[PDB]
Amino acid sequence: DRATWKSNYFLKIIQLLDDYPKCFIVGADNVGSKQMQQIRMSLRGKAVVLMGKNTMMRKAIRGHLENNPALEKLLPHIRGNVGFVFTKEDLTEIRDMLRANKVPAAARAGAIAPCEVTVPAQNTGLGPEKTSFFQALGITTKISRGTIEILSDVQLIKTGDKVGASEATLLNMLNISPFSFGLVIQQVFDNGSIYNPEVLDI
Amino acid sequence: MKASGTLREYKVVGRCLPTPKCHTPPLYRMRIFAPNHVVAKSRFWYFVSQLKKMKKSSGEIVYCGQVFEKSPLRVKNFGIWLRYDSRSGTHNMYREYRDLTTAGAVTQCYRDMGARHRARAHSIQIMKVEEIAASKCRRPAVKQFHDSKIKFPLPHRVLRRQHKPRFTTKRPNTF
């Protein structure tokens, strides 16, 4: 395989370039499968997101066909996890600023940036015992009526701090919102136009 | 065979005896590498007996001639095909040699098959010898000798084993 599939992918990208002459450059450096499902099924009625490897560098060959305006401007812009968002409707400058949806924020080891985790005096509300993680890290807790509360007010993960496995499990069980990060818009492309979105669009 | 010294290329043509049931034999032709023409004729009878219905008694050799080199002053590339018989089972083989003449390249082929694979002159049957040009050589050794403006010095070159006196005050250096 992977020859007829690549020819079909070239048919899909020439169909999108011939159908939708307007596009958004995005990046998905912090991505998830459930996140992409939520973004796609929220944007079924509008613009379509597409990704890929160096096969995305196909506008060069599409310009070597010479049937285009200056579409070759975005060729040095596909660097570092760059994907396309093909659109037809807009003509509208309120897209994705009212649709930048909040995503979980499920705790996973590895991230450092940007925020902190402050846990005030608040009960867990979980089943017995739910003190093993608190004893593994070290947190002054007190047992009230069965939900167990926390005496002090300490910070678990500071700015630039490595998330660990036990920290990830306790944040996933306590459901206190960890680091979440959606997609990034980088460049707008509307009919051969060179936008400078710092800050011109929207 | 023996492959004593350098080899020699022979063009040998041979036919069957003219019989009343079948006149005009097809008068076949080969290309035999051999140290001399007697070994060329015998190895010719060997190959033609293994190929077609021929034997030395009911046949004859018409011509057995030396084949001189078409361009002796040119460093050329030769692909040799081999039908050598190993200890377990026989194998085919393609080898490449950068050398001047055809007989010298086939000589290097016999010496190299004696060196590396321990094969005698009995087991080696040369299938085909073909001069190939540049940019078609498979082998990395001949492919890395394919270099215009090539450079290499000669490091640690020791020589003259007792051409000097056996008892000198020297202590000889290299290069």
């Binding site: - | 990395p140 050794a141 890395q144 270099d147 090539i150 450079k151 290499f152 010095p153 490091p155 640690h156």
Partner: protein, 191 residues
Amino acid sequence: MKTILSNQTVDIPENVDITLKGRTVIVKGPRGTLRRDFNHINVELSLLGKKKKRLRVDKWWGNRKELATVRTICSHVQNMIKGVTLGFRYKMRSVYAHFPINVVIQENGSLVEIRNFLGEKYIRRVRMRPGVACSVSQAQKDELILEGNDIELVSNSAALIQQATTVKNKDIRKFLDGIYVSEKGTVQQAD
């Protein structure tokens, strides 16, 4: 297959100087100097560049193991450059069982004295290499920092420490105790 020349390329920064009298390489820099001998390899070591310092490690015909050897020279020259610009710092946290490991230094940080040693009464002494300085870290529990210039000397001293702290005649899946090399790095950071 008797491969014609294999050469490795080394860029040397302006902070240090190099001098070769043959196969002996002498590198002088801010954190001392360091000299080594490559007498047993027979690979050409040439330099070029007027205040540009481009070293080349060049070997002619050789064999496959010797073509493997020609990269080892480039790697040890890179290690000498890193050791003379930044130095080597090895951090060793004392992974200790019920009995702690009391580590002191005696003779200018060159004699590491280990006590309580898995509960053994035998006080152990380890003499380090000429040219490596050790210290006990601050603001961190039972960390041992080995600082030096030559990576072979520093890491052999750390190997002597982590083999001096060894569980004997027991299971070593349980009793995970000893002083192991935790982090390898440089002295001067952000470089």
